[PDB]
Amino acid sequence: AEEFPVPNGFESAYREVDGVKLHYVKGGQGPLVMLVHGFGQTWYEWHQLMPELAKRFTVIAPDLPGLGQSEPPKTGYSGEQVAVYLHKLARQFSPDRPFDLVAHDIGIWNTYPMVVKNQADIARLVYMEAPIPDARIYRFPAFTAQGESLVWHFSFFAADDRLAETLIAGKERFFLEHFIKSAASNTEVFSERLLDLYARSYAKPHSLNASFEYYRALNESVRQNAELAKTRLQMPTMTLAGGGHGGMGTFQLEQMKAYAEDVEGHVLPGCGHWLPEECAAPMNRLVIDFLSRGRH
Template identity: 30%
Template sequence: MPTDTDTAPDPVTGTTGVTGVTAGETADARLAATLDGAFSSRYAEVNGVGLHYVTGGEGTPLVLLPGWPETWWEYRKVMPALAERHQVIAVDIRGMGGSEKPRSGFTKKNMARDVHELARHLGHERINIAGHGIGAMVAFAHAANHPAATAKVAILNTTHIDDSYYDFPMVPRPGDQGPHRWWLAFQQVQDLPEQLLADGRYRHLVDYMFNLSLLNPDAITPRDRDIYARAYSAPDAIRASQGWFQAYREDIADFNAYPKVTAPMLGLAYGAFYDYMRRALPTQGTDVEVKEIKNTRNYLVEEQPEAVTEALLDFFG
């Protein structure tokens, strides 16, 4: 049977502690307590996996799914304002942060089932859902596979993986517009990433990814980067995060079989990807709106939280 407790695995050690002002308080519980409003760190067993989530607020349920290399903490700047109108549920997806690190189940279709069962476990038959990066793919898969359970869906800066990913070059041609997505191939390699990135070295990858895409590097502080690096530094966390990328072939096959999403869908993106999303999303849904978030790149939630909050509140109502 699913459980719902204030107990969660520590994102670094994988051990379990009880939240509250005790010696066993987890890092996630401490972080949740720093947010404005009454947010709590919780844990539930659903679909055969333990999921960690942080929740607060009242109203219609709004599930937030993070991207890589982040955790639920990605949404820290927008959660308090969203919680004024919604019950916010920021979830560490399967393999992320305080959630369990299984060895399988990383197709976005199955991870969408994780979220669907978590929502039902919390008493919600229908949810609003927003995702960024890998989380955006899971959010899209939720809307495609559970249409009756999806009220509205917001896709932040990353459309669901499709056949175009097979065409990314190993070596970019002179003049090709970046970034060159070398990390997609790196994540396909078995065993080696755990050896290269463990023992505190994941911080180098965290810094690289953020510095590549932030117009304002201070939008994600050294403390925030430490939080993310700690969440990914253990070998099982590295292996699990690779699972998201190593499931891409199955994800593409699933995507090609999906009908158009019928829930109202919002796309938020920047610059060139905004132009791409304006072309792509209307072919994937029946009721689509796309807005540009300016003065940012990939990590728009952390770099432009006010604009993202306004767009989400306007869309979700």
């Protein structure tokens, strides 16, 4: 059974990586591009980009460990631990050539360490809508003169006593709608059917827990990255951020400048946090053009 409809010409499949059964959807021909989703979502957030990208690239979109249809990690949920699974998965399909990486939301947390540690393996990098975990996150305000801040959920999700699972269980559909729409500019793209699909997936008890374990490991990820960041990224990089309600604005590019020698960035007016769904056409265009500057 599939949690989300697979696009025509793609296959839903599984690979064991270090004893963890990872789910992915894969299609196309050419050099490999890996697309990595974030919280509240699955591989499916890429379903509109995948068909167009598959015209020029072999495209793979995995479910993060514990989410979608992927087994939980056996090591842990820190960025460095999770990135190993994603790196080895990619290498199973692109052993002889570097591959491209596109990541969104906590997809960034779960890929950065494998990028900085295996630079020869990464041809081009696209990062959108999420801080790389570092001391910058400790400056985000708890509360704003407009109400809810962007990242108060960091503390909610990281809290012990299984605070988040306990409060959210039985109300996954309600919570996810509030969470997604509150960080959106374009709330309409999130139909009741779409939210139904996402809620059913993350409502699996192991997935609801997995979701929050990423946040419970965030400080550890920050400590890990403090060491990793001593080495700058050298591959061509592009950042994307939403310029509307819910988006990161200039933060995305400004942070990445401290990490990457060769980076260009765009802020998309009228778009919030969920770029692939809120602003699919221009996001898809920018990603395709950026990756197509290389061999394909």
